[PDB]
């Protein structure tokens, strides 16, 4: 998702969410102190790479150990 | 006529005719000499 989909789509989506919060009663009593924005382009590449690598390592580590220790041989 | 021949010389049509002739030749070669993992004539 972070590697295929890129930023501008999510920025416009966050804008439509900021309007939603300011116009919703009760919740508009809570104000964010940092403006919501979409992740940076470089940040998106990094976050997508980290998810890719973590899934890579964890998927293979699970299969490796379970297929080997399940038989132990 | 000259425009028709100029169309036949465009890249996709020339590629199809050239690759069709090439595909047919390799098919007949593997038809008269099927399999062959080596160069047997030495």
């Amino acid at each position: 998702m972070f590697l295929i989909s890129w930023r501008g789509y999510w920025q416009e989506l966050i804008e439509t969410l900021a309007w939603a919060h300011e116009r919703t009663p009760l919740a508009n009593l809570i104000r964010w102190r940092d403006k919501p924005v979409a992740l940076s382009i470089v940040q998106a590449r990094l976050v997508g790479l980290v998810h890719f690598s973590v899934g890579y390592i964890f998927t293979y580590a699970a299969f490796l150990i379970a297929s080997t220790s399940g038989k132990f041989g | 006529m000259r425009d028709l021949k100029t169309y036949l010389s465009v890249a996709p049509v020339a590629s199809t005719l050239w690759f069709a002739a090439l595909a047919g030749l390799l098919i007949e070669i593997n038809r008269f000499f099927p399999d062959a993992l080596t160069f047997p004539f030495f």
Partner: protein, 73 residues
């Protein structure tokens, strides 16, 4: 084992290719002759001149990690 070792050679060569092209084109290229002024990690240089997505050396690293994971895989 002969076929797998050549896949290994493919993985080493391509991962080396990505990292070396990024390291040598990090200070500049025909597309962006002043890349050294923009630093190591920046998003891009805009849609002008045809499009310059993933043109920094950081992006070269980011592309090479996929090939590293594929090679070690």
């Amino acid at each position: 084992d002969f076929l797998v070792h050549h896949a290994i050679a493919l993985g080493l060569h391509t991962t080396t290719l990505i990292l070396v092209k990024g390291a040598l084109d990090a200070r500049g290229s025909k597309l962006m002759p002043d890349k050294k002024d923009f630093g190591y990690s920046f998003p891009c240089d805009g849609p002008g001149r045809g499009g310059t997505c993933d043109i920094s050396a950081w992006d070269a690293f980011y592309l090479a990690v996929f090939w590293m994971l594929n090679t070690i895989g």
